């Protein structure tokens, strides 16, 4: 923790995985894996050792009335 | 077609003066089980729940489940054109949006009014039944004076239910004070306790809740952990009237 919260914030702004501020984080991870762009096997291995926490399993701007 | 007839119009006038300040619009759910109502206040803080059971109306007739939309100010103005001894009948169609009220004096004078209803798009809410753990049954006059007397000091009040009795405290810029009450027919204060309670509620809502004091002699206060305080009144072989208010955090 506090290092796992920057890896996800770095996965969320890389443009080669998609334009993602409307959906979940694991849905975008599996969308890129289907098309197989290059999802890395570390943004998966922190979404498995946690429960349904809203500060891991949510996009950066999931507040913010946009 | 709906038609009811009730001999004690005074009960109707007391219930309509319970609510004309807290609520401006309501929907009456007319059924074959009685006349039942739920509403929120205008401030979106408190809940009212009113039940007039079907038996206590001394001449009942309801064909089909209705829903009437009533502006409570115009109805409260109409029900003060009827003295305290009259006999009140309600007449409604199942195709119309206009209600008829006929007041029958117990002596040569009969009166009849027609009032236009309105269509409203409100949503109906309710309550679930759980066991509140502090159960107070107290005189209504003492509760009215206690709320009205603490009101001049400050605006919150803390209710403190302990073993032998309950204790109400309130503060403000001109100081603070409490009132005790202890276990010792209707002038008694019966106190059932399993877990002790201490909670805080604002006074403007309580001074709204104590407007319906002529409906009964005693009042029932129910408390539990972190739930909305319930204020309950009973109307004799007619039904009941409940207000609901949430605690401060």
């Amino acid at each position: 923790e506090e290092a796992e919260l920057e890896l996800l914030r770095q996965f969320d702004l890389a443009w080669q995985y998609g334009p993602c501020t409307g959906i979940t984080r694991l849905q975008r991870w599996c969308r890129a894996k289907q098309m197989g762009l290059e999802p890395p096997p570390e943004v998966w291995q922190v979404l498995k050792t946690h429960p349904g926490d809203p500060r891991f399993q949510c996009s950066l701007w999931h507040l913010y009335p946009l | 077609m709906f038609e009811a007839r009730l001999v004690q119009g005074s009960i109707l006038k007391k219930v309509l003066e319970a609510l004309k300040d807290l609520i401006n619009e309501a929907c009456w759910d007319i059924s074959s089980s009685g006349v039942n109502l739920q509403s929120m206040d205008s401030s979106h803080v408190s809940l009212v729940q009113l039940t007039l059971r079907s038996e206590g109306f001394d001449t009942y007739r309801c064909d089909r489940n209705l829903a009437m939309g009533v502006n409570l100010t115009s109805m409260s103005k109409i029900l003060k054109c009827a003295g305290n001894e009259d006999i009140i009948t309600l007449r409604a169609e199942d195709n119309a949006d206009t209600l008829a009220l006929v007041f029958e004096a117990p002596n040569e004078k009969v009166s009849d009014y027609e009032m236009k209803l309105m269509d409203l798009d409100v949503e109906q809410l309710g309550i679930p039944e759980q066991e509140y753990s502090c159960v107070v049954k107290m005189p209504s006059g003492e509760f009215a004076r206690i709320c009205r007397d603490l009101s001049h000091i400050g605006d919150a009040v803390v209710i403190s239910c302990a073993k032998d009795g309950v204790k109400f405290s309130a503060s403000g810029e001109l100081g603070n004070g409490n009132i005790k009450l202890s276990q010792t027919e209707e002038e008694a204060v019966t106190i059932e306790m399993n877990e002790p309670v201490q909670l805080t509620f604002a006074l403007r809502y309580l001074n709204f809740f104590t407007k319906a004091t002529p409906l009964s002699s005693t009042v029932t206060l129910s408390m539990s952990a972190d739930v909305p305080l319930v204020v309950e009144y009973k109307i004799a072989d007619m039904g009941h009237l409940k207000y609901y208010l949430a605690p401060k955090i």
Partner: protein, 763 residues
């Protein structure tokens, strides 16, 4: 400070020549601009100071650079110990400093600004130019860019990310830094500033700091050296007021026979010109005596003074006024040959400025707190004004009469201190125009020169409500059929109200004056009130704005906007309204009826926290009384009952801590009877179900069509079709109108799942 972005041009060339952007992390290249990157902020501030020394600009502009940008840079350079930053000026050994200043007048109000010292260079913040010249509703860059052209915590994670995010941030910053240049060259700011400095004789820094006194002092001194006079110093605290202008009593109502308007042009400067009034020719009460020559040596005014004829002296204020009048005449002669509309109004702005200068020459005399007051002159001016307008009204109503061979004796319906609205009688606009031109040219031959009356318009029909409140339709020629409406004073040009009310007043006067159909007007006002009560009106139409003036007058009595401003937020005690700006608010519903200052809230706070709206406040306090002003004079008091009955057929249709403890009782779609089970239809209203499904799928169909037109408009206003939209612009109707249709669709989609599915889905 993480990014600085700069645009530079030579004046006269239609594009810039320099385009630079300096960032603080490594970035990605932008076509058309240079990009440099640094790993520390000291290098960034040093690089900007060296660039600003080497390019060596004449003028520095921007938007809110005085009160935000330059003192932020100066304080940030002081904190990080960089010694060589604050030397931005032209003199090689001088450092710059922050210094407070205030300005106040009854014309622009009071404003408090900081200044930063730059010797040699000139500053033009475009915000201060807008706030001084223009009277608008919001003064944000988005609002004035829409009005003239047509358009913090997210940025901190666009900068802590990657370098294409930083490239997006730099393109945004460069568009921001480019908009005030376009506004400066499009609005003809600098050309008018240079012409003002050449006509008045004051420097170019005084037209951004001072008022209208230094210019008239300057012109009077420049005219005083040519005859050898010296100015005295009189100072007095304080004299009394004098009597201002007359207004003629109306004949109120609705007119449908044409009224012609005749007025005097440049009234007070020509009074001061053609009766030889000046400081330097004011005759004291004794110095006429014991000489007895009254005839053609002096004159007498209605207030009582005596003033010397022009065969002895020429005053100084006639000559200054004559120069200003010729400059404005040349500006109008240039304006009479344009075809573009925005260019036509900016030349109108130039001539408006020269007429304001000529009238402030007269207003200099009566200012008892000033530098040289002579209230005798002011009283003589307004006495001559009153005498001449009552002369006009007597003459116009007296000559053209039934006994004098004409058709009908005319009757004046109105006059306000420079104009006369005479009602002639004919209903043909050609004959009214012909007689009105004859009347203007006839009456003008009873005066000295340059006193002239002129025809200006014909109103057909006309609507007179009170003093300083009327409306009409505008005729310039006859075969030029009609131009527009005129709304003098009414609820459509003031800024103290809601957009909903001003729009309703404009649409009612449109349907009532152009098409002459009161039934569509009643149906329109009914639909507005019905859609108000049914809770389908956007909150853009509900926002009220008020100006936060000096704090002691707002200490004297409790207001709504003062209460909202002085109540800080928990989020930000560092961004709040200051003195002089405008506070926006809406009124929410509560039970504290003694105080409308206890129900006011910020629009963004009621956005994010979802508080309800007081529809009865907006119904009886905002809407109702302007409508009763407008709709009554065409009919009787059965018209008040007609609109209050239009309301009455439509008032009976209203849409609706403890809120979490819901039960969510289902209800019959046909007859609204709460009941156990989830089926949509009631057992008595079960047959009629195909019609009840038919009804409401044409509502889902129309919500679907509104979702798509809005959420793809943001993609075209943003620029890109492949990346996310981030624009929470509070001055755009687009924002928060795109937020409620998601919830309407969320609700209307779930109401139709009460009905089963129209088929399987797992086959």
């Amino acid at each position: 400070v993480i990014q600085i972005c700069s645009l530079g041009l030579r004046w006269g060339e239609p594009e810039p020549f320099l385009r630079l952007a300096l960032t603080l992390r490594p970035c990605a290249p932008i076509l058309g601009a240079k990009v440099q990157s640094y790993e520390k902020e000291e290098d960034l501030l040093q690089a900007w100071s060296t660039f600003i020394r080497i390019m060596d600009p004449d003028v520095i502009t921007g938007y809110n650079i005085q009160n935000f940008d330059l003192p932020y840079l100066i304080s940030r350079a002081q904190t990080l110990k960089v010694q060589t930053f604050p030397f931005l000026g032209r003199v090689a050994g001088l450092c710059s400093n922050i210094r407070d200043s205030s300005f106040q007048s009854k014309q622009t109000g009071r404003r408090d600004t900081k200044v930063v010292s730059m010797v040699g260079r000139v500053q033009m913040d475009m915000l201060q130019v807008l706030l001084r010249e223009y009277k608008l509703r919001s003064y944000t860059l988005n609002a004035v860019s829409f009005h003239f052209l047509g358009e913090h915590s997210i940025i901190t994670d666009l900068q802590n990310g990657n370098d294409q995010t930083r490239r997006r941030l730099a393109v945004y910053c460069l568009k921001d830094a480019y908009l005030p240049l376009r506004l400066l060259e499009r609005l003809m700011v600098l050309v008018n500033a240079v012409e003002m400095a050449r006509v008045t004789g004051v420097p170019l820094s005084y037209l951004l700091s001072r008022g209208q006194q230094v210019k008239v002092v300057s012109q009077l001194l420049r005219q005083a050296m040519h005859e050898g006079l010296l100015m005295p110093v009189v100072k007095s605290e304080g004299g009394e007021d004098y009597t201002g202008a007359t207004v003629i009593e109306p004949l109120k109502g609705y007119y449908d026979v044409p009224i012609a308007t005749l007025d005097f042009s440049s009234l007070y400067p020509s009074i001061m010109m053609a009766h030889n009034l000046c400081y330097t020719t004011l005759l004291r009460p004794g110095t006429a005596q014991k000489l007895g020559l009254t005839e053609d040596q002096f004159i007498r005014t209605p207030t009582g003074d005596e003033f010397v004829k022009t065969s002895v002296r020429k005053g100084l204020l006639p000559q200054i006024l004559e120069n200003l009048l010729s400059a404005r005449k040349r500006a109008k002669a240039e304006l009479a040959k344009e075809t573009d509309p925005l260019r036509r109004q900016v030349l109108d702005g130039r001539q408006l400025a020269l007429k304001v200068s000529a009238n402030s020459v007269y207003g200099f005399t009566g200012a008892q707190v000033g530098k040289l007051p002579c209230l005798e002159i002011s009283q003589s001016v307004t006495g001559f004004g009153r005498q001449m307008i009552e002369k006009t009204k007597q003459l116009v109503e007296s000559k053209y009469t039934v006994e004098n061979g004409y058709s009908t004796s005319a009757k004046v319906v109105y006059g306000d201190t420079d104009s006369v609205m005479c009602r002639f009688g004919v209903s043909s606009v050609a004959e009214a125009m012909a007689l009105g031109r004859e009347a203007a040219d006839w009456v003008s031959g009873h005066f000295p020169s340059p006193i002239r009356l002129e025809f200006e318009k014909v109103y057909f029909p006309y609507l007179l409500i009170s003093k300083k409140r009327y409306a009409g339709l505008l005729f310039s020629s006859r075969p030029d059929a009609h131009d527009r409406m005129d709304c003098k004073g009414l609820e459509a040009v003031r800024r103290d109200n809601c957009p909903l009310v001003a729009n309703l007043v404009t649409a009612s006067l449109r349907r009532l004056l152009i098409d002459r159909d009161p039934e569509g007007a009643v149906a329109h006002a009914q639909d507005v009130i019905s859609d108000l009560l049914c809770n389908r009106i956007d909150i853009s139409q509900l926002v009220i704005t008020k100006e936060l003036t000096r704090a002691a007058s707002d200490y004297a009595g409790k207001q709504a906007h003062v209460e909202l401003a002085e109540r800080m937020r928990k989020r930000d005690p560092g961004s709040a309204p200051s003195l002089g700006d405008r506070v926006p608010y809406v009124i929410i519903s509560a039970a504290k009826g003694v105080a409308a200052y206890m129900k006011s809230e910020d629009p963004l706070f009621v956005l994010e926290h979802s508080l309800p709206i007081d529809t009865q406040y907006y119904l009886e306090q905002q809407l109702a009384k302007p409508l009763l002003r407008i709709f009554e004079p065409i009919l009787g008091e059965g018209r008040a009952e007609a609109v209050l009955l239009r309301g009455d057929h439509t008032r009976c249709k209203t849409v609706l801590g403890l809120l979490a403890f819901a039960k969510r009782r289902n209800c019959c779609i046909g007859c609204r009877t709460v009941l156990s089970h989830q089926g949509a239809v009631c057992e008595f209203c079960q047959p009629r179900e195909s019609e009840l499904y038919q009804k409401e799928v044409s509502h889902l169909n129309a919500l679907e069509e509104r979702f798509s037109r809005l959420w793809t408009q943001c993609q075209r206003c943003q620029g890109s079709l492949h990346e996310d939209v981030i624009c929470t612009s509070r001055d755009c109707p687009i924002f928060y109108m795109r937020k409620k249709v998601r919830k309407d669709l969320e609700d209307q989609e779930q109401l139709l799942r009460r009905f089963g599915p129209p088929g399987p889905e797992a086959w």
